[model samples]
Target chain A: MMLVLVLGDLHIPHRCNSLPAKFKKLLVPGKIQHILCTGNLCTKESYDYLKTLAGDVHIVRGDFDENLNYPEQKVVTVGQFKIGLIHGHQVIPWGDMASLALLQRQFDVDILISGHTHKFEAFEHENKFYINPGSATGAYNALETNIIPSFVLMDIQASTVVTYVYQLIGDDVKVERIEYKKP
Target chain B: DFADEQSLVGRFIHLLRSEDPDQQYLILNTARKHFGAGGNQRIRFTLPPLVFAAYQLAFRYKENSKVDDKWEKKCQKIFSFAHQTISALIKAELAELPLRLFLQGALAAGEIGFENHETVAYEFMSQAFSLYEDEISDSKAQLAAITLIIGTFERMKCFSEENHEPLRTQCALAASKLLKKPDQGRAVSTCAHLFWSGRNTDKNGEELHGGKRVMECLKKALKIANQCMDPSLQVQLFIEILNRYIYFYEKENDAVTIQVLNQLIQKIREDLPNLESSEETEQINKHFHNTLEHLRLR
Candidate 1:
C-alpha cells in the first residue's frame, strides 16, 4: 500500500507568502510517497518548497504558475488507484462536474484531482473520486472574501485509502475523514 | 382562510432568506394567488412586498431558470400596485424611511423595469421627503431620522444617469444638517449608513468626501456618547458609534482603519461598564479576526 498526498493551487506570493507551516513541516521527504500538485505554486520558492518535500512531485501548469518544467497534465498510480492531476481552468465554464468527468475518462484514472475555482468539491461518480482541494490558501475571488485555507491528506494501506481533509476556520483547523474502496 | 392567508404571508417573509428553491416557488405562487382573488387590501399591499422580494430571488436564479410567463405576470401585478401605493403614501404624507423601505423592496423585486428602477424609486422618494416632518430632538429620535437620510441617498444613487438632482439635494441637505458637528446617535448612525450605502455602490465611483464628513460628525457624536448628562444615553450612544464604525470601516485594513476601529471598540468597552457581548459585536469580531489572520499570513 502507498499514500500520495493530492492537493494544489497554493497560489503563494500572490495570495499568501507560503503554505501553512503546520502542513509544510509534514511535507518532509519519505513521509509522502508521491506528491501530486495541481500547480499555481506561482513562485520559484513554492516550487523549491515542493522539491524539498519530495524528489518525485508531479505537477500541471496553472494559469498563474511560472514553472515550465511542469506538464499541463499528469498521472500517478498509488496503491491500486490511478490518479489524474489537472489545474482545470482550461475547461470552459469552470467547476461543472460533467466536463471534469470527461477529463477523468480521457486520462483513464480512478481518481482525478483539480483546482482553480478556489472552492472545495468532492464527488464520486461511477467508481471514480473527483477532488478539487480548492485554494489551500484562500485568496479573494470576484464575489467572496476571506477564503479559509484547506488541504487534503491520504492514509493508504493494502487496498484501503482513508482520505482526510483539514480546513482552517479562524485559528482552528477542523478535520474530516472519508475513505475510498478501490474498484 | 384568513388565518391561513396571514400564515402564508408570514411564511413568505420568512422564506425571503431561505435557500430552498421549492420553498421560494411555493411562497411566490401563494402570494400571487392571494393577490388575484381580490384578497384584502392589506394582502394586496403585501403582495407588492413579496413581488419585490421574489424579483430579487428570481433575478439571482434567472440564469438557472428561464423567466417564464408566471414571473412576468407576477411582476406586472406588483408594478401596478406600486403606482397606487406611491400616490396613497404621498397623499398620506408618509416619512422618507417608510417610503424608501417600500421602494427598496420593490426595486429589488425587479418590477419597476420601466427604463430605470432607480428613477422610479427617486420619484417616490423625493415626494416622500417633501411631505415628511423633521423634529429630531434627542439621540434616540435621530435613529429614525437617519433612516430618511439613507433613503434619500439611495434614490439619488439609483437615478444618477437621469440627473436626479431633487433626490440628491433632498439627501445632501438632510444629511448635512442631521450629521452635523456635536453629532448624536441619530447623526452618527446616518453617517455610517451613508458611508456604507455609497461605499457599496461604487468604490471608485466618487469619493463623495463623505467619509471625512462622516468622521467630523462622528467625532462630536463620540464626545456626546462618551460624556453626556444621562449615563444610559451615553452608554447607548457608545454602542451606536461602535456598531456604526464596524459597519463603515470594517473592510479597510490600513493603520487609520485599524486605529479607528480599535479606538471605537476600546471607547465602548471602557465607557459603558455594562458593555456586554452583542451579537453584532461578536459577528464583527469574527470578520475582523478572519481579515486580520489573512492579512498576517499575507
Candidate 2:
C-alpha cells in the first residue's frame, strides 16, 4: 500500500504561524510516499516542510502563492485511481458539493481533492470520493474565527482506499477512518 | 509481441496507472523492446502514446538512479519517437486524437521532460486552440487540456509567434464562456495580463477595457467567494484583485485609473477588519498603503 498525504490551506506566516506541535510530532519523514498539497501554502518555508515529508510533492497553485507559474489544477494517478487536485478557490461558491461535482466530472477522476474552506470534510458523491483536508495550521476562515487543524492520509491499495482523517481540537488530536472500494 | 497494436496500447495505459514503481518502469522497458528494432509496421501509431506515458513516469518515479546521462538519452529517444509519431498523425488528418496526443507528447517533450523542441511548441499549442474553437460541445476535459497548453506556453516563454496573442485572447474569452464565475475570473485575469502587456488594442484600433474588465470579473468572483462563507479566502480574493491595480498602474500610468484603483483599495481596506485578522491583514494593508503612496508620487 502507498501512503499519500493530502492537505492544504496552511496560510503560513500570514494567518496562523505553523503546523500545530501535535501535528508535527505525528507527521515524520520517510513515512509518506507522496505529498499532494491543495495550495495556499503562502510561503516557501511551508513548502520546504512538505518536501521533508516526501520527495514527490505535487502542489496546485493557490491564490496567494508567489510562484505564478504553478498550474491551477493537476491530476496524479495512484494505485488504479486517478486523483485530481485543485486549490478549490476557483470553484464558484467555493467548496460547495455541486461545484466540486462539476469539477470532478471535468477531471473525470475517481477522487477529487481540494482545500479552501478551512473546515474538515469528507463525503462520497455520486460514487466518487471528495476530500478537503482543511487548514493544517487551523488558519482562521473568512466566515469564522475558529478552525480545527486537520489533514488526511490515505492507504491506497490496488482496488480500495482506507482514509484516515486527523483533526486537532483544542490541544486534542483525533483520528477517524473512512473506507472506499472501487466499483 | 504476438498481440495487436490496440492491446499493446491498452496494456501501456494500464501500466501507466499501476501503483508499483516496478510495473511503471517495466512499461518503459517494454516499449523500448517492442518498438526498438524490427517492430511491426503499425508501430508508429502507438509510439506517441507510449512515449507520452513513459515521460510521465520519468517525472513521477522515485527510484534510485545510477546512470543520469544514460537515462537522459533514453528520455530523448522516447520523445524523439513521439515527435515523429505526432508529425505522421497530423499528416494523416486524424484531427481529434492526434491533436490531443500531440499536446500530451509536446508537454512531455518540453520543459517537463528532456528539453529539445522549443521551435514547435507554439505550433502544437496553436493547433490545440483551433481545435478547441471549432468544437463548441467540448467537454471540461478539453478545457483543462487547453488551459494546460496555454499555461505551459506562457511558462515556457513560447508566445513569440504572431498568432500567440490572438490565441491567448480567444482562449481567455472561451474559458469565461465555458467555466463558472470563479473559474472565469482566472481566465479573465490571464487575458487581462496579456492585455496589460500591450495587447489591449483590437483590429479596429479601439482600446480593450483591460482594467475595467478585470475589475468586473474580480467583483463577480468576490461576490461568489464571499457566499462560500470562508473569510480568509474572501480576504485572499480581495488581495488578489487589489494586486491587479498595481499591474494596471504599471501599464500606462493613467492618473485617473490610479485614483480609481486607490479608491478600490480603500474599499478592500475597509473590509479587512471584519474579515480575518492576522499578519495577512497587516501585510495587505501595508502593501496597498505603499502602492497608494507610490502612485501619488508618480
Candidate 3:
C-alpha cells in the first residue's frame, strides 16, 4: 500500500501562523510516503515544514506563492491511480466542479485534487474523484477570515484506495475516511 | 510604410514565432511606432487580437524560459503594449470580448508576475468589470466575464494588505448583485462567500460579516448544487459548508452551527445513495460513522 498526503494553501506568516499545534503533532515524519501540496505554502519555512513530513514533495503554484518555479499543474501516478494536482485559482469560477471536471478530462486522471477555496471538499464525479483539503493553517480567504484547518491522507492499494481527511476543529482533531475503487 | 504589400499585421504575426525576446520587442515597438501615428484607426481593429496574442506569447515565454533580466524587460514591453492598446480600445468604445479578455489577462499578468502594478491592475480589472456589466444580452460571455472579474478580485484580496475590507466587500457585492442560473449562481455565491466574513458590526452599524450572511450564501449555493442534479457537486458543496460550519463552531462555540453540521452529516449519509449503490456505499457509510464517532470522542 502507498500512502500520499495531499494538502495545500498553508499561507503561513501571511495569513495565520504555522499549522495548528494539534495538526503539527499529528502530521509527523515517516508516516506519509509522498506529499502533494497545492501551493500557497508561501514562505520557504512552510515548505520546509512539509518536507519534514515526506521527502517526495510535489507543489503547484498558488496565487500567493512566490515560488515561480512551481508549475501551474502536475500529474503523478501511484498504484493504478493517475492523480492530477493544481492550486485551482486558474479555473474561472475557482472551485466549481464543472470547471474541475474539465480539468480532470484534460489531465485524463482518475482523481484531481486542488486547493484555493480554503475549504475541505471531496466527491466523485463522472467516475472520477476531486478533493480540496482546504487551508492547512486555516488561512484567511477573500470570502471569509475564519477558516478551518484541514488536510488529507490517501492509502492506496492495487484496485482501491481510502482517503482520510484530517481537520482541526477548535482544540479537537477529527479524521474522516472516504473510499474509492477503480471501475 | 508599404513593403512588398505585406501590412504590419503580417509582420507582427510572423514575429510572434521568433525565439528571441529582443526580436519580439523590436517588432512590437516597430509596429507601435508605425501604427501609433494618427489616422491609424483601421489598424486599431487588428491591434486588439494581436495584443492579446502577444500577451499570451509573453506569458508562455516566461513559463518556458529562464528568469533573466532581459526576459523581464521583454515582459514589461509586452505588458505595456497590451495595456496601452486595450486602454485605447476601451476608450474608443471598440472593446469587445477579446479585448476584455485581454484586459483580464493583463490584470493577471501584472498581479501575478514581475510587473507588480497593483494600482493599475485594479484599474485594468475595473475596466473589465464595467465592460462585463454592459454585456447584459450575452449570458455566456457575461457569466465568463463575471467569473473572471470575481476571480481577479479574489486574488487581489489574497495579496493586498491595505484595502482588504473594501476589496472583500466589493467582491461580495459583485457576486450577490448578479442573478444567474443554478450553476452560475452557485459559482457566484461560492466566490462571494470567500470575501464575506459574516462578522460585520461596530458603532456605525454595517452588515455583519460572519456566520449568518456566510451561511445564507452557502445555503443558496447548496440549493443550487442540489438542483443541478450532480451528486458529486452536491457532495462537494455539502462538504464545503460542513467545513465552514465546523470552523464557525470552533470560533463562536455555537450550538445551532454544531446542529447544522450534524444535520449535514446526516444529509450526506442519505445523499450517498445517489452517488453509489454498491458495496462502496457500505464502506462510505462506515467511514462517516467512524468519522462522527471520532469527532464525538474528542
Candidate 4:
C-alpha cells in the first residue's frame, strides 16, 4: 500500500499569519510515498515546502497560481488506480457539483481531487470518489470565517483506495475516513 | 428647445434599456454633446429593469414628499419597463459576458441618484453586479465587470469622504464582498489588488477605513496558507499579500510591515524544498527573487 498526502489552496502569508507549529511537527518527511497536489501552492517556497514532505508529488496548476510552468491538468498513478488532480477554476459556474462531474469524465480517473472554494467536501458518485479540502486556512469571506487547515491521506492498494481526511482545528488534528474501490 | 431637450432625454432613457451595443454608445455620446461635461454628468445610469423601477419609484413619489394620486399606476409602468427590459436584455444569451464597463457606468450614474433615494439607488446599482456575476464564464468579460464594480465604488468612496461621512453601509458592504470570497484563486490574488487600491491609503497609521477588519481577514487567510501542507501555495498567497502591503503602504516604514516580510521570508526558506517538489517551484523562486530584489528587502 502507498500512503500519500493531498491538499491545496494554502493561500499562505496572505490569509494567514503562519502555519501552526503543530502541523509542522506532523509533516514528517519520507513517511508518505507520494503527494498529489491540486495546485494554487502559489509560490516556489510552497512548492519546495511540499517536496520535503514526500518522495514524489504530482501537481496541476490552479487559475490564480501564476506559475506558468504548471500544467492545467495532470494524472498520477498510485498502485493500480489512476488518480486525477486539478485546481478546477476553468470550468464555468464555478464549483458546481454537476460541472465537476463533467471534469471527472474528461479526466477519466478512478479518483479525483480539487480545491479552490476553501470549503472541504468528500463524496462518492457512480463508482468514483471526489474530494475538495476547501481552503486549508480559512481566508477572508464576507459571509463567514472558519478556516480549518486540512489535508487528506490516501492509502492506495492494488485495487482499492481508502481516503483519510485530517484537519487542524484550533490545536487538534482530527481525522475522518472515506474509501472508494474500482468499478 | 424644451421639447428637443425632453426628446433627447427620452432617447437617453430609452438606450438605457436597449441591449444593442452601438445604440447604447450613440445615446451616451449624444447626451455628452448637449450637456457638455457637466450636463453629461447628470445622466443617471441604472440597468434597465431594476434601475428603471427605482427611477420610477423616485420620480413618481418624489423624495421626501407626498406621492401623487396617479403615481402608483405610473410606478407600475416603470416596473414593467424594468421587468420587460431585464427579461429582454439579460436573457440567457445576452447575459453571458461580463459587463464591467457598462456596469461601472451604470453604478456611477446610480451614485448620483443615491443623494435623493439611497435604497432604490443602491438596489438598482447593485443588481448590475449581480447580473454580471451570474454570467461567470467568458473570462474576457471579468476585467470589464470588475473594473465597473471597482470604479463605481471608488467614486462612491470619494463622494462620501467629500461629504464627510464615514463609510456608507452599502459601499462598505460592497467593498468587503469584492475583496472577500473571490470565486476562486483569482480572488485570492485579486483581493490583494483591492486591498492596495481601496483598503490601504495611509502609510504609517492603520487602514484609513476599517483596516483592522480587513487585516484580520487577511491574517486568517495567511494562517491557512502557512498550515497548508503545500509550501508553494502558501508562498504565493504570501507574495500577493506582501505586494498588496507594498502597494498600499508605500509611504509607511512601519516595523510591522518589516516584521511580516521577515516572517514570510523565513517561511519560504523553510518550505522551499517542499515547494520545489511540486511543479511550481522555479516560477515561485523567480517571483520571490524578483520581488525581494525590487524591494531591496533582505
What's the lDDT for all of these models? 0.54, 0.61, 0.62, 0.52
Off by over 4 Å in 1: B1-298
**Model 1 per-residue lDDT at B74:** 44
In candidate 2, which residue ranges exceed 4 Å CA deviation?
Answer: B1-298
- Docking level of model 2: incorrect
Tens-digit lDDT track of model 3 for B41-73: 444444543564555556655655575656656
**Candidate 3 CAPRI grade:** incorrect
Question: Model 1: which residue pairs collide?
Answer: B52-B109
Candidate 4 C-alpha lDDT tens digits along A1-183: 788888877644223323456767877887888888884665455778888898588878764353557877787877898788888555322455654654565456778888765677889876778888665544322112245777778888768778888787767788888878887
lDDT of 2 by residue, B1-298 (tens): 3224543464455436456544555555566556545244454445444544554554443122453545555555545555555555455444455555555444544443344444445555666666566643545444454455444444333333364566656756675665454444445544444433332123333334356555554455445445534555555455555555455555563532756666666666667667456766565555445444444632
lDDT of 1 at B219: 63
Question: What proportion of the real contacts between chains A and B does each prediction keep?
Answer: 0.00, 0.00, 0.06, 0.00
Task: Write model 1 residue lDDT over B1-57, tens digit each, in one string.
Answer: 432343344445544535654356555555555555644444423443453344444
Per-candidate Cα RMSD to the true structure, in Å, reads 20.4, 17.1, 14.9, 23.0
The whole-model C-alpha lDDT of candidate 3 against the native structure comes to 0.62
Scored against the native two-chain complex, candidate 2 gets a DockQ of 0.03
- For model 2, how does the per-residue alpha-carbon lDDT over A89-176 read when each residue is reduced to its tens digit? 6664355575576456546678889987788888897678999898887764523335789999999978799889999977789899
lDDT string for model 4 (B1-298, tens) is 3112433343345434344332433443344344433222132222222333233232423232343454444434333344333444454245522243233234333333323323333444556557665764455445334433443443332232322123233333333334223322333333332332342222332334434443544564565455544455656666655554443344342423667767777776666556445446765665566556546763
Compare candidates 1 and 3 on TM-score and give the better one: 3
